[PDB]
Design a protein around this nucleic acid. Sequence first.
RNA 1: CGAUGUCGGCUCGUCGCAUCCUGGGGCUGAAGAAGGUCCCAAGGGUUGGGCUGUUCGCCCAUUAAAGCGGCACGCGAGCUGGGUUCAGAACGUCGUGAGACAGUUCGGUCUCUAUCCGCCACGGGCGCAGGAGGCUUGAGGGGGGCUCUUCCUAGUACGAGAGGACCGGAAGGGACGCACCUCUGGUUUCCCAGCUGUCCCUCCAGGGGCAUAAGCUGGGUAGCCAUGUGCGGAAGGGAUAACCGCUGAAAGCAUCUAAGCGGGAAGCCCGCCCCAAGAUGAGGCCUCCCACGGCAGCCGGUAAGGACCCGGGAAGACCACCCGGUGGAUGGGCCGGGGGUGUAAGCGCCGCGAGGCGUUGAGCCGACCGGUCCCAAUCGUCCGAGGUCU
RNA 2: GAAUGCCGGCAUGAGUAACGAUAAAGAGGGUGAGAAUCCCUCUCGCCGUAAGCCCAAGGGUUCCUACGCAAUGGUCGUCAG
RNA 3: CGUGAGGGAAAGGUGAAAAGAACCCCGGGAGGGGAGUGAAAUAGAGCCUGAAACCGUGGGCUUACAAGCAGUCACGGCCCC
Lengths: 59, 118, 204, 122, 131
Amino acid sequence: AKHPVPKKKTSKARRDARRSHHALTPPTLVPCPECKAMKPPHTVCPECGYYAGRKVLEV
Amino acid sequence: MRHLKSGRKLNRHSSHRLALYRNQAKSLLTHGRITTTVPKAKELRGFVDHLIHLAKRGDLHARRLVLRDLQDVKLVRKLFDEIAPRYRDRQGGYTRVLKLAERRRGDGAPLALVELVE
Amino acid sequence: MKGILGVKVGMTRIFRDDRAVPVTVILAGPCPVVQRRTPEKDGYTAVQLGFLPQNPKRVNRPLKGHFAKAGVEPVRILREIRDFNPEGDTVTVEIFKPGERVDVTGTSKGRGFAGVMKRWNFAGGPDSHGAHKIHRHPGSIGNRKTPGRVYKGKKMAGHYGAERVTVMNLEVVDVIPEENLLLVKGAVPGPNGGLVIVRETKKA
Amino acid sequence: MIQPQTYLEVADNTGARKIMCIRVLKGSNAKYATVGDVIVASVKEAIPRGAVKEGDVVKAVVVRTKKEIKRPDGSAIRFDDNAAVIINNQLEPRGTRVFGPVARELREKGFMKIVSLAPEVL
Amino acid sequence: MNRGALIKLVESRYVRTDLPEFRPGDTVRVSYKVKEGNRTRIQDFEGIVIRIRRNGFNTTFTVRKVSYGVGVERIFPLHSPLIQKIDIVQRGRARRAKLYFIRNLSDREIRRKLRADRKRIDQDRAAERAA
RNA sequence: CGAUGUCGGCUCGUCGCAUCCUGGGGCUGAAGAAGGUCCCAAGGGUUGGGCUGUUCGCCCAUUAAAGCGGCACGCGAGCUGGGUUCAGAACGUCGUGAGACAGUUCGGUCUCUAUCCGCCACGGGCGCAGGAGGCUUGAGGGGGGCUCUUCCUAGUACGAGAGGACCGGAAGGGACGCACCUCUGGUUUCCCAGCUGUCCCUCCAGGGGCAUAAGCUGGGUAGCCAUGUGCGGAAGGGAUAACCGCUGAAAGCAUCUAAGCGGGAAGCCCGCCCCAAGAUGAGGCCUCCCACGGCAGCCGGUAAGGACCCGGGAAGACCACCCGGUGGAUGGGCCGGGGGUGUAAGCGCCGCGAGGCGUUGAGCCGACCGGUCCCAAUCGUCCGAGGUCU
RNA sequence: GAAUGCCGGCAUGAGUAACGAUAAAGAGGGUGAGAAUCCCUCUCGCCGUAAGCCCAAGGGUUCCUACGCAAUGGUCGUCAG
RNA sequence: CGUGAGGGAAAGGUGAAAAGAACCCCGGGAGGGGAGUGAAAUAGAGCCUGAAACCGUGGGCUUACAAGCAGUCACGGCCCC
Ligand SMILES: [Mg+2]
Ligand SMILES: [Mg+2]
Ligand SMILES: [Mg+2]
Ligand SMILES: [Mg+2]
Ligand SMILES: [Mg+2]
Ligand SMILES: [Mg+2]
Ligand SMILES: [Mg+2]
Ligand SMILES: [Mg+2]
Ligand SMILES: [Mg+2]
Ligand SMILES: [Mg+2]
Ligand SMILES: [Mg+2]
Ligand SMILES: [Mg+2]
Ligand SMILES: [Mg+2]
Ligand SMILES: [Mg+2]
Ligand SMILES: [Mg+2]
Ligand SMILES: [Mg+2]
Ligand SMILES: [Mg+2]
Ligand SMILES: [Mg+2]
Ligand SMILES: [Mg+2]
Ligand SMILES: [Mg+2]
Ligand SMILES: [Mg+2]
Ligand SMILES: [Mg+2]
Ligand SMILES: [Mg+2]
Ligand SMILES: [Mg+2]
Ligand SMILES: [Mg+2]
Ligand SMILES: [Mg+2]
Ligand SMILES: [Mg+2]
Ligand SMILES: [Mg+2]
Ligand SMILES: [Mg+2]
Ligand SMILES: [Mg+2]
Ligand SMILES: [Mg+2]
Ligand SMILES: [Mg+2]
Ligand SMILES: [Mg+2]
Ligand SMILES: [Mg+2]
Ligand SMILES: [Mg+2]
Ligand SMILES: [Mg+2]
Ligand SMILES: [Mg+2]
Ligand SMILES: [Mg+2]
Ligand SMILES: [Mg+2]
Ligand SMILES: [Mg+2]
Ligand SMILES: [Mg+2]
Ligand SMILES: [Mg+2]
Ligand SMILES: [Mg+2]
Ligand SMILES: [Mg+2]
Ligand SMILES: [Mg+2]
Ligand SMILES: [Mg+2]
Ligand SMILES: [Mg+2]
Ligand SMILES: [Mg+2]
Ligand SMILES: [Mg+2]
Ligand SMILES: [Mg+2]
Ligand SMILES: [Mg+2]
Ligand SMILES: [Mg+2]
Ligand SMILES: [Mg+2]
Ligand SMILES: [Mg+2]
Ligand SMILES: [Mg+2]
Ligand SMILES: [Mg+2]
Ligand SMILES: [Mg+2]
Ligand SMILES: [Mg+2]
Ligand SMILES: [Mg+2]
Ligand SMILES: [Mg+2]
Ligand SMILES: [Mg+2]
Ligand SMILES: [Mg+2]
Ligand SMILES: [Mg+2]
Ligand SMILES: [Mg+2]
Ligand SMILES: [Mg+2]
Ligand SMILES: [Mg+2]
Ligand SMILES: [Mg+2]
Ligand SMILES: [Mg+2]
Ligand SMILES: [Mg+2]
Ligand SMILES: [Mg+2]
Ligand SMILES: [Mg+2]
Ligand SMILES: [Mg+2]
Ligand SMILES: [Mg+2]
Ligand SMILES: [Mg+2]
Ligand SMILES: [Mg+2]
Ligand SMILES: [Mg+2]
Ligand SMILES: [Mg+2]
Ligand SMILES: [Mg+2]
Ligand SMILES: [Mg+2]
Ligand SMILES: [Mg+2]
Ligand SMILES: [Mg+2]
Ligand SMILES: [Mg+2]
Ligand SMILES: [Mg+2]
Ligand SMILES: [Mg+2]
Ligand SMILES: [Mg+2]
Ligand SMILES: [Mg+2]
Ligand SMILES: [Mg+2]
Ligand SMILES: [Mg+2]
Ligand SMILES: [Mg+2]
Ligand SMILES: [Mg+2]
Ligand SMILES: [Mg+2]
Ligand SMILES: [Mg+2]
Ligand SMILES: [Mg+2]
Ligand SMILES: [Mg+2]
Ligand SMILES: [Mg+2]
Ligand SMILES: [Mg+2]
Ligand SMILES: [Mg+2]
Ligand SMILES: [Mg+2]
Ligand SMILES: [Mg+2]
Ligand SMILES: [Mg+2]
Ligand SMILES: [Mg+2]
Ligand SMILES: [Mg+2]
Ligand SMILES: [Mg+2]
Ligand SMILES: [Mg+2]
Ligand SMILES: [Mg+2]
Ligand SMILES: [Mg+2]
Ligand SMILES: [Mg+2]
Ligand SMILES: [Mg+2]
Ligand SMILES: [Mg+2]
Ligand SMILES: [Mg+2]
Ligand SMILES: [Mg+2]
Ligand SMILES: [Mg+2]
Ligand SMILES: [Mg+2]
Ligand SMILES: [Mg+2]
Ligand SMILES: [Mg+2]
Ligand SMILES: [Mg+2]
Ligand SMILES: [Mg+2]
Ligand SMILES: [Mg+2]
Ligand SMILES: [Mg+2]
Ligand SMILES: [Mg+2]
Ligand SMILES: [Mg+2]
Ligand SMILES: [Mg+2]
Ligand SMILES: [Mg+2]
Ligand SMILES: [Mg+2]
Ligand SMILES: [Mg+2]
Ligand SMILES: [Mg+2]
Ligand SMILES: [Mg+2]
Ligand SMILES: [Mg+2]
Ligand SMILES: [Mg+2]
Ligand SMILES: [Mg+2]
Ligand SMILES: [Mg+2]
Ligand SMILES: [Mg+2]
Ligand SMILES: [Mg+2]
Ligand SMILES: [Mg+2]
Ligand SMILES: [Mg+2]
Ligand SMILES: [Mg+2]
Ligand SMILES: [Mg+2]
Ligand SMILES: [Mg+2]
Ligand SMILES: [Mg+2]
Ligand SMILES: [Mg+2]
Ligand SMILES: [Mg+2]
Ligand SMILES: [Mg+2]
Ligand SMILES: [Mg+2]
Ligand SMILES: [Mg+2]
Ligand SMILES: [Mg+2]
Ligand SMILES: [Mg+2]
Ligand SMILES: [Mg+2]
Ligand SMILES: [Mg+2]
Ligand SMILES: [Mg+2]
Ligand SMILES: [Mg+2]
Ligand SMILES: [Mg+2]
Ligand SMILES: [Mg+2]
Ligand SMILES: [Mg+2]
Ligand SMILES: [Mg+2]
Ligand SMILES: [Mg+2]
Ligand SMILES: [Mg+2]
Ligand SMILES: [Mg+2]
Ligand SMILES: [Mg+2]
Ligand SMILES: [Mg+2]
Ligand SMILES: [Mg+2]
Ligand SMILES: [Mg+2]
Ligand SMILES: [Mg+2]
Ligand SMILES: [Mg+2]
Ligand SMILES: [Mg+2]
Ligand SMILES: [Mg+2]
Ligand SMILES: [Mg+2]
Ligand SMILES: [Mg+2]
Ligand SMILES: [Mg+2]
Ligand SMILES: [Mg+2]
Ligand SMILES: [Mg+2]
Ligand SMILES: [Mg+2]
Ligand SMILES: [Mg+2]
Ligand SMILES: [Mg+2]
Ligand SMILES: [Mg+2]
Ligand SMILES: [Mg+2]
Ligand SMILES: [Mg+2]
Ligand SMILES: [Mg+2]
Ligand SMILES: [Mg+2]
Ligand SMILES: [Mg+2]
Ligand SMILES: [Mg+2]
Ligand SMILES: [Mg+2]
Ligand SMILES: [Mg+2]
Ligand SMILES: [Mg+2]
Ligand SMILES: [Mg+2]
Ligand SMILES: [Mg+2]
Ligand SMILES: [Mg+2]
Ligand SMILES: [Mg+2]
Ligand SMILES: [Mg+2]
Ligand SMILES: [Mg+2]
Ligand SMILES: [Mg+2]
Ligand SMILES: [Mg+2]
Ligand SMILES: [Mg+2]
Ligand SMILES: [Mg+2]
Ligand SMILES: [Mg+2]
Ligand SMILES: [Mg+2]
Ligand SMILES: [Mg+2]
Ligand SMILES: [Mg+2]
Ligand SMILES: [Mg+2]
Ligand SMILES: [Mg+2]
Ligand SMILES: [Mg+2]
Ligand SMILES: [Mg+2]
Ligand SMILES: [Mg+2]
Ligand SMILES: [Mg+2]
Ligand SMILES: [Mg+2]
Ligand SMILES: [Mg+2]
Ligand SMILES: [Mg+2]
Ligand SMILES: [Mg+2]
Ligand SMILES: [Mg+2]
Ligand SMILES: [Mg+2]
Ligand SMILES: [Mg+2]
Ligand SMILES: [Mg+2]
Ligand SMILES: [Mg+2]
Ligand SMILES: [Mg+2]
Ligand SMILES: [Mg+2]
Ligand SMILES: [Mg+2]
Ligand SMILES: [Mg+2]
Ligand SMILES: [Mg+2]
Ligand SMILES: [Mg+2]
Ligand SMILES: [Mg+2]
Ligand SMILES: [Mg+2]
Ligand SMILES: [Mg+2]
Ligand SMILES: [Mg+2]
Ligand SMILES: [Mg+2]
Ligand SMILES: [Mg+2]
Ligand SMILES: [Mg+2]
Ligand SMILES: [Mg+2]
Ligand SMILES: [Mg+2]
Ligand SMILES: [Mg+2]
Ligand SMILES: [Zn+2]
């Protein structure tokens, strides 16, 4: 190869337009039925250790 | 393509992946419950279930087969005398995987507990 | 024109007149008529066939209203056969007899992102004699300053498969109405378990 | 499945022992010859004082191949060597006898004389 | 639906059961139906079966023999209607499923490697004592 | 000249037509068959080798044919580096010499990261005046487009003979394309077995690691595949080219033409296959929800619906797509079947022993075809109409 | 306002290449504000004419212990030349 | 930096006075928020003034059928005085 190189500096506009897909999506969170704490669905609650209505974990 | 191909690779060559499964088995049978990454936890279900099922048959042949993977005679003795009898009436499902809420700090990996069922 | 929706079940071979005949087995009917397309109402003629009954607890209201207006149980797939107006309200394998030729349409198997050698049967490069990291590469894609661009439709790497493909003029080898089974000589696009359409051939 | 450069045993008594295919006489650009197809070949080995000698450009028909032959009855046949019988432009054999079995496909292709000279037709 | 059973169903009309069980290493005579013009005849093909390729109805087996100085192998659909009958000529004991290695063996060495399977030769003699 | 890399090859094409072949023609010093010559025609096709760096060319074996040119003598941020023009060395030759020649001869560093346009694929956004779930029309694009042999007609027409048709009909091929895995043939990184050396568990027996990122070897399912299998080129309709006519003046005859009509190509339009309503010209049909509160606008709660999350998938780089989420067989286990391997271990018996025999087609056993709630898809959250004006 | 000017600052390329041998990891326990990365235990793998041990050059406190983590360490760090 | 001869930098400024921010609060710390000092604290020590490139937060106008050395001339719409 022969070392490709940018021909022009990218403009502020074109740099930030390329970043129009970069914003984060917030985490998916549901309340724990036992302790009402927000937490990801399908995970053992990190605040009380309950899953499927029963204690699984010391926390 | 990967069409209808079974089995994760876990970025390990063949003998390392096998030694991973054997090692996680020993740890799971020793402690009853371990924490790993979700994909490792999922793959370990089938590996250990098979060894528990051979312990349920209980014969000499089964004991020698299980020892190929577990090597620890005291551990196999524990699997035959204490673990396997509590699954006499249970047909499969000797292990469960549950996903943990918090990822690991240094690499973001999602984690899961694997455990023997009651 | 006559047609029916089906499932590709598998391949085998039968023996006919001391010849081994490769066959694809297709589970075709039965297909209820769910809607008819007319020139007055829709500007053309076709029958919308239904196929594979569905758990109603999976069928939302606008679909349910569509079925109920036809007095039809909830079905998994709706597809139209162009220029087909069957007399009955249910299309079955008996629209085809052994000896007829058919066109079969399915979704071909998906290669995903495919190289130039698998997708376009390019020759690739030499594997020795100094060849340098181009063993599977396409080679040149153009000229120089004239025209200074690459043609539309240039054959290049990309997704390949998982697309509609029609194979034409396949001999119907057997029809087994008891099990809604069509036997078609030869190969038929897609995986076992894939949805297919069987139509009367357009080859005279 | 014979192509240019393939060596073939000579299953006749013309004096040739080994021939090397230089053409598959099957249209503009056939890639392979199988049983029943004619080839052009160079004679690479011959016994002293035969009908054909080393260096002769000859025609021959393929009578058995190592690549198995598929038949419409769903069966197949395969031989241990690649063998040919030297012929003249009228498809008749240039020798008087034929050694080893030959594929039955030959009969259907019009090499009736070679088929009947053979000791076995498989 | 059950796609395997539907396939086995389509196949059921062609499955035969008149033929005798055999193993790689057995010597088998296949009476095979053959066309030639303007007649059709039965030709016997006798040799060692070096391979059984199992896929239910699509099972095939391969028989090797030497004919006039030249080795010949035939592949047969195990349920082909062109097979009139198969006769067991000898039971051989092999130590493996595929006997490809015998293609590179002298006649002597083959005889040394595939000796007569006494247990199954006696099994055939025990049966064949019918009422 | 603050650099536009230079022969040939490979790869990948695309275009011109002054056409090599195939299709259509007129003239022939065209009996037939085969040619010659010119006209129309660029749809497709245009082989494999020996020599040489070669382009070219000659030659071998075929072929319907083995066309010629353009694209920076197309294509080195695509590859090669044999040719050729750096430094070494030598021959011929020239020069007193240092050196020189394009003359010859052997050798001689070819740079991981693509910003923009372009190209192949895939999404995200918004739009298509209510919000939705489906099913579609096809404007417009693309793909494809080749050809030979044998037989019948008929050994007929034609010809002294040799030879040998038109038209019409049938079968079989070559190369190419799309799909497929039943068969044939591959692979199959751990599915099974055998083997060596060493270390180890536990001494025997039985096993484990390592010898490659399989230690080696013999096999090998699903999948992915070609060497394997099916299928395609059309048919047909329409309008034409050269060319041939009908009727027919100007021009009492004649003339295919000035009015008018017909025939006529592998080529053109359609027909086949694939994409396609961002076709902003944003199309059509079926069905679903409803005119909700508070100040062509805002705010909030909802509907039909959807998304999130999770189990997954012959779908896939991520994304997307598709299935399923306890009213569940989605994956994992377990069970049956298929399939591979080819008779486990233990025990008994024979042998001094290596081993052999029996139990036993045993044991092991990925993916394939199913069954089964044993394990896991718990529990939930968020978004989403109130339909502008004439 | 230009001298491929000079010095400095700050952009673009871009969240891109890369993170330096394909000998390889897993779990449990501990510590801590924080742990894939520190300590301990068990299992696994790699070297073993070395990838082990001794000596001479050269280097010059890098040695040992306690306390610590801003920077240095291609990540992290409670660890450390 | 260079074996060496030799080459050879960058780097100034709180305030009149340290009065250099006790104490409380979040934090492991860093950092900040109060309190307090000062005429002044965007003079708080990474300190006079504090330009420009460059980066960001908020607001007005504007933009998803469009062809561009990016301006200019015109008219209209919206927002502001
Ligand atoms: Mg390169
Ligand atoms: Mg390059
Ligand atoms: Mg490059
Ligand atoms: Mg390179
Ligand atoms: Mg580069
Ligand atoms: Mg540039
Ligand atoms: Mg900006
Ligand atoms: Mg951009
Ligand atoms: Mg707590
Ligand atoms: Mg794929
Ligand atoms: Mg791969
Ligand atoms: Mg997988
Ligand atoms: Mg799977
Ligand atoms: Mg595995
Ligand atoms: Mg791997
Ligand atoms: Mg990785
Ligand atoms: Mg690793
Ligand atoms: Mg290894
Ligand atoms: Mg290893
Ligand atoms: Mg996954
Ligand atoms: Mg879970
Ligand atoms: Mg999570
Ligand atoms: Mg960490
Ligand atoms: Mg489909
Ligand atoms: Mg490629
Ligand atoms: Mg290919
Ligand atoms: Mg392809
Ligand atoms: Mg190639
Ligand atoms: Mg090459
Ligand atoms: Mg190649
Ligand atoms: Mg190189
Ligand atoms: Mg290189
Ligand atoms: Mg290479
Ligand atoms: Mg390339
Ligand atoms: Mg241009
Ligand atoms: Mg796709
Ligand atoms: Mg039939
Ligand atoms: Mg399939
Ligand atoms: Mg000679
Ligand atoms: Mg012979
Ligand atoms: Mg099947
Ligand atoms: Mg059934
Ligand atoms: Mg015979
Ligand atoms: Mg024999
Ligand atoms: Mg019969
Ligand atoms: Mg220049
Ligand atoms: Mg420059
Ligand atoms: Mg320049
Ligand atoms: Mg330059
Ligand atoms: Mg060209
Ligand atoms: Mg012309
Ligand atoms: Mg021409
Ligand atoms: Mg002509
Ligand atoms: Mg003449
Ligand atoms: Mg003529
Ligand atoms: Mg002519
Ligand atoms: Mg003309
Ligand atoms: Mg053309
Ligand atoms: Mg063209
Ligand atoms: Mg051309
Ligand atoms: Mg040539
Ligand atoms: Mg050569
Ligand atoms: Mg040579
Ligand atoms: Mg050459
Ligand atoms: Mg040449
Ligand atoms: Mg020349
Ligand atoms: Mg010459
Ligand atoms: Mg010819
Ligand atoms: Mg010709
Ligand atoms: Mg040119
Ligand atoms: Mg020139
Ligand atoms: Mg020139
Ligand atoms: Mg050039
Ligand atoms: Mg050229
Ligand atoms: Mg070039
Ligand atoms: Mg280059
Ligand atoms: Mg070049
Ligand atoms: Mg270039
Ligand atoms: Mg370049
Ligand atoms: Mg380039
Ligand atoms: Mg060179
Ligand atoms: Mg070189
Ligand atoms: Mg040279
Ligand atoms: Mg030369
Ligand atoms: Mg120099
Ligand atoms: Mg030189
Ligand atoms: Mg030189
Ligand atoms: Mg010399
Ligand atoms: Mg001289
Ligand atoms: Mg001179
Ligand atoms: Mg001179
Ligand atoms: Mg002189
Ligand atoms: Mg002199
Ligand atoms: Mg000079
Ligand atoms: Mg010179
Ligand atoms: Mg020169
Ligand atoms: Mg010389
Ligand atoms: Mg050299
Ligand atoms: Mg040279
Ligand atoms: Mg260099
Ligand atoms: Mg470079
Ligand atoms: Mg990069
Ligand atoms: Mg780019
Ligand atoms: Mg540009
Ligand atoms: Mg979109
Ligand atoms: Mg979108
Ligand atoms: Mg319409
Ligand atoms: Mg169109
Ligand atoms: Mg358009
Ligand atoms: Mg078209
Ligand atoms: Mg005749
Ligand atoms: Mg006559
Ligand atoms: Mg004809
Ligand atoms: Mg044809
Ligand atoms: Mg298969
Ligand atoms: Mg296969
Ligand atoms: Mg097969
Ligand atoms: Mg096979
Ligand atoms: Mg194993
Ligand atoms: Mg060992
Ligand atoms: Mg020992
Ligand atoms: Mg010990
Ligand atoms: Mg031992
Ligand atoms: Mg070891
Ligand atoms: Mg080692
Ligand atoms: Mg190793
Ligand atoms: Mg091994
Ligand atoms: Mg070996
Ligand atoms: Mg094999
Ligand atoms: Mg193998
Ligand atoms: Mg396979
Ligand atoms: Mg092929
Ligand atoms: Mg016409
Ligand atoms: Mg006339
Ligand atoms: Mg007239
Ligand atoms: Mg006149
Ligand atoms: Mg006219
Ligand atoms: Mg006309
Ligand atoms: Mg006309
Ligand atoms: Mg006419
Ligand atoms: Mg054609
Ligand atoms: Mg479509
Ligand atoms: Mg639309
Ligand atoms: Mg559409
Ligand atoms: Mg438009
Ligand atoms: Mg619409
Ligand atoms: Mg809802
Ligand atoms: Mg997935
Ligand atoms: Mg992602
Ligand atoms: Mg969707
Ligand atoms: Mg959907
Ligand atoms: Mg769903
Ligand atoms: Mg749910
Ligand atoms: Mg429920
Ligand atoms: Mg399930
Ligand atoms: Mg299941
Ligand atoms: Mg199973
Ligand atoms: Mg079985
Ligand atoms: Mg079996
Ligand atoms: Mg035994
Ligand atoms: Mg004894
Ligand atoms: Mg089984
Ligand atoms: Mg459950
Ligand atoms: Mg049930
Ligand atoms: Mg909840
Ligand atoms: Mg100036
Ligand atoms: Mg510059
Ligand atoms: Mg510069
Ligand atoms: Mg510049
Ligand atoms: Mg400067
Ligand atoms: Mg300046
Ligand atoms: Mg400067
Ligand atoms: Mg600067
Ligand atoms: Mg930057
Ligand atoms: Mg920079
Ligand atoms: Mg990224
Ligand atoms: Mg990253
Ligand atoms: Mg980039
Ligand atoms: Mg990248
Ligand atoms: Mg680096
Ligand atoms: Mg990277
Ligand atoms: Mg590196
Ligand atoms: Mg590394
Ligand atoms: Mg730990
Ligand atoms: Mg811990
Ligand atoms: Mg850590
Ligand atoms: Mg930490
Ligand atoms: Mg590490
Ligand atoms: Mg430690
Ligand atoms: Mg040693
Ligand atoms: Mg030092
Ligand atoms: Mg010390
Ligand atoms: Mg120290
Ligand atoms: Mg310490
Ligand atoms: Mg630090
Ligand atoms: Mg730190
Ligand atoms: Mg820190
Ligand atoms: Mg400090
Ligand atoms: Mg650092
Ligand atoms: Mg760090
Ligand atoms: Mg470093
Ligand atoms: Mg600390
Ligand atoms: Mg350190
Ligand atoms: Mg130390
Ligand atoms: Mg120096
Ligand atoms: Mg110094
Ligand atoms: Mg100096
Ligand atoms: Mg200074
Ligand atoms: Mg001071
Ligand atoms: Mg001061
Ligand atoms: Mg403070
Ligand atoms: Mg404090
Ligand atoms: Mg604190
Ligand atoms: Mg605190
Ligand atoms: Mg502080
Ligand atoms: Mg604060
Ligand atoms: Mg104050
Ligand atoms: Mg004042
Ligand atoms: Mg100020
Ligand atoms: Mg101030
Ligand atoms: Mg002052
Ligand atoms: Mg200041
Ligand atoms: Mg400042
Ligand atoms: Mg802003
Ligand atoms: Mg427009
Ligand atoms: Mg607009
Ligand atoms: Mg303007
Ligand atoms: Mg104006
Ligand atoms: Zn909770």
